[PDB]
């Protein structure tokens, strides 16, 4: 009575992982100034958003097994590495530095090569204390990234401005968006939706606080791979973004010297004016309000224990300081004033000014990425960013939550948690009463 | 995009399968991440059409086949297949007999082509 009938275009799909191409905004390289993220090559140009609400469709999401975040990690690392190939190589100054010893800068002297292979020039350069390791008055020193890798300068035109990067999908695949409020990122999703392209994920790299990210819809969301495990970082998402203002109020001089044929090495010469420590300002009232909300949300998941935020234990500045990138100058801030309280609540309501230490020998990715040298920026730099999340790390009456800690991927797991790569299978066989070939 | 009516039962969705109908589409890191996707999508589409053509359809969204519905594939009657069953659920139910059904359809189209050639004498 019934006969096979073949349908093409049926709504049948499976979980799959494939290569997702980029689609940046029409600005290309930010009106055509080379971005490290190579965003004019994200050829797709994103004109219109096509979405479909999958009605009566429940799909299971597990943000900790997403391959989108790993693809983002590899793409970001590759884009960062490929931007440093054209730039100057700084092997000539893995050299003994005659640094003047008794501010964090140090006045160092070293013999450096000139454009002629025969001749050598004595150079004076101000190197930060964080970029200097004792060789073991006028003690002798060396750059930190001398016994590990060979550093490469940053190209002057290359700009590290994170602009949105969209992960779109090839034909025959689809991306499923959860659209469900207060999503823990692990479980059933009721209004799953099919999108071609993800929202703009800014490749913002930071250590203890997630800046400029996507902020939650209805409440603060706590996402950890394994709450019982204390080696699993707790990713906090914000309903509302605390505002951080970070400045370097010292006018600096870049005085390029020639260390080879066509190779200019830009060093910090001196400060024209006052010497001022760099800092980042965070309103006390807003920060403590948001931290109280985070403490309540942590009480919900941690047996109503008293939640104690305590400053990071210590180690490398990259690991235990808030690291970010203001205007091409990399900051390493002390968040001890931020994360120091017990709830169940400091009553200050004024600006919290946290010290920051600029670095120049940059290793953003812990060995997987290259090591670079960031040339100084001439004028004073001011960047206005909103923090939208925290990365905590509980340690084993009360639970203590050190800030920071995590992999590089955890910055983008608040972005790619709701997206799932899905393969569409359009062939379908069903019994119907046609009977004709 | 083919995924719109996905919680709808097969009877209600089959109407909306043709409503969409795919009506209109009118060496850096991203250099290869698009070329590989292009080639894979093209060859996947060509494989889908190659399967579709071997059964005699070759360009029909809803294609009619003369293969009788074997009961081992599904004992479910037409009404409870098309009124309380979605496409993912159905293809999961008949996930074990897709290769056999493909072979039967290819054999049936071969038989029909042989009969057509024989009638032409």
């Amino acid at each position: 009575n019934l006969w096979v009938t073949v349908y093409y275009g049926v709504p049948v799909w499976r979980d799959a992982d494939t290569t997702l191409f980029c689609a940046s905004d029409a600005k290309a390289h930010e009106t055509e100034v080379h971005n490290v993220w190579a965003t004019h090559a994200c050829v797709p140009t994103d004109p219109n958003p096509q979405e479909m609400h999958l009605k009566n469709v429940t799909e299971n999401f597990n943000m900790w097994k997403n391959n989108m975040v790993e693809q983002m990690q590899e793409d970001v690392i590759s884009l960062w590495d490929q931007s440093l190939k054209p730039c100057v190589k700084l092997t000539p100054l893995c050299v003994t530095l005659n640094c003047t010893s008794a501010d964090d800068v140090r006045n160092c002297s070293f013999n450096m090569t000139t454009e002629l292979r025969d001749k050598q020039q004595k150079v004076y350069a101000l190197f930060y204390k964080l970029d200097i390791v004792p060789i073991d008055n006028f003690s002798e020193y060396r750059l930190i990234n001398c016994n590990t890798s060979v550093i490469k300068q940053a190209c002057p035109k290359v700009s590290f401005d994170p602009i949105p990067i969209h992960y779109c999908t090839p034909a025959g695949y689809a991306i499923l968006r959860c659209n469900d409020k207060k999503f823990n990122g692990t479980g059933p999703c009721k209004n799953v939706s099919s999108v071609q392209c993800t929202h703009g994920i800014k490749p913002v790299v930071s250590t203890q606080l997630l800046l400029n990210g996507s902020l939650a819809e209805e409440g603060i969301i706590i996402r950890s791979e394994n709450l019982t495990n204390n080696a699993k970082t707790i990713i906090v998402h914000f309903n509302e973004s605390v505002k951080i203002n970070c400045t370097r109020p010292s006018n600096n001089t870049r005085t390029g010297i020639h260390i080879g044929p066509g190779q200019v090495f830009y060093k910090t010469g001196d400060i024209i004016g006052d010497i001022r420590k760099a800092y980042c300002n965070i309103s006390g009232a807003q920060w403590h309000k948001v931290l109280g909300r985070v403490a309540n949300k942590l009480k919900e998941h941690f047996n109503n224990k008293t939640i104690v935020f305590k400053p990071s234990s210590g180690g490398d500045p990259e690991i235990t300081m808030h690291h970010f990138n203001c205007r091409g100058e990399f900051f390493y801030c002390n968040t001890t004033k931020l994360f120091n309280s017990t709830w169940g609540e400091t009553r200050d309501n004024g600006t919290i000014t946290i010290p920051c230490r600029i670095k120049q020998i940059i290793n953003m990715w812990q060995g997987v990425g290259q090591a670079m040298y960031a040339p100084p920026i001439k004028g004073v730099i001011k960047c206005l960013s909103n923090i939208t999340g925290i990365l905590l790390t509980r340690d084993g009456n009360n639970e203590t939550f050190r800030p920071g800690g995590g992999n590089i991927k955890d910055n983008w797991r608040n972005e790619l948690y709701k997206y799932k790569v899905v393969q569409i299978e359009p062939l379908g066989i069903a019994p119907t009463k046609c009977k004709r070939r | 995009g083919f995924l719109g009516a996905a919680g709808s039962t097969m009877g209600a969705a089959s109407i909306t399968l043709t409503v969409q109908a795919r009506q209109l589409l009118s060496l850096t890191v991203w250099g290869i991440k698009q070329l590989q996707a292009r080639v894979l999508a093209v060859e996947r589409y060509l494989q889908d059409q190659k399967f579709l053509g071997l059964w005699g359809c070759s360009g029909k969204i809803i294609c009619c086949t003369a293969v009788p519905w074997n009961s081992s594939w599904s004992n479910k009657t037409f009404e409870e297949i098309w009124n309380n069953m979605t496409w993912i659920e159905w293809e999961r139910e008949i996930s074990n007999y897709t290769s056999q059904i493909y072979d039967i359809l290819t054999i049936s189209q071969t038989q029909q082509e042989k009969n057509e050639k024989d009638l032409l004498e």
Partner: antibody
Amino acid sequence: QIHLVQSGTEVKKPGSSVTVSCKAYGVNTFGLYAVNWVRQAPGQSLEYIGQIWRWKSSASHHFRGRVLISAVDLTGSSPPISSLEIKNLTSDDTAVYFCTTTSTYDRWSGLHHDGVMAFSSWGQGTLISV
Amino acid sequence: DIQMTQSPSTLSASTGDTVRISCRASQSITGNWVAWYQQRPGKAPRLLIYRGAALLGGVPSRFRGSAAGTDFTLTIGNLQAEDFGTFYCQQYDTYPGTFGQGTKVEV
């Protein structure tokens, strides 16, 4: 891996209510897992009591209204916990009780079907005498 | 609602003797929604086969299954000492899942 442990062994007078606990080690959450409660008689075959699936509680017709199944997923201290509470115990309940969890994450695994699923991870069991 | 029965209520075999444990259903399980278990004495059931003939990880490849309409069979090639124990037949094609009586394999 994954390990299911139940709450020891209890002997109670008829008419009392017994609570069996199911602590699932290795289960990331009960959003992607389903706890299925099954009872084995001392000599007979296994029966099916009820389940929690996507945080929805259900029991078979034989056990409707006479059993309660509750579950809470990962906290800071404890793994996901599932509780089977029988009410109005009778001598016919002298059976071993098992707790099972299956991964309902991917729809094409075959271990689950429309909420009626196989049983993949098995706990030690709480024999109950009454 | 679907009652599944297991062919050999008890069975007798030794090491190296392959046994076919059969199972039949009250209805036609065309979706192959049948699962097989093993219960050693004093232990919990262990899953061996799901979806008719699919094997879990960590289960010996010697266990295999077949699905044909209402007839489901479990074959144990090169039977070994640990394999001895009660085997169960489960269907999850329709609510509620139902278990077969048993097939004890003894030396």
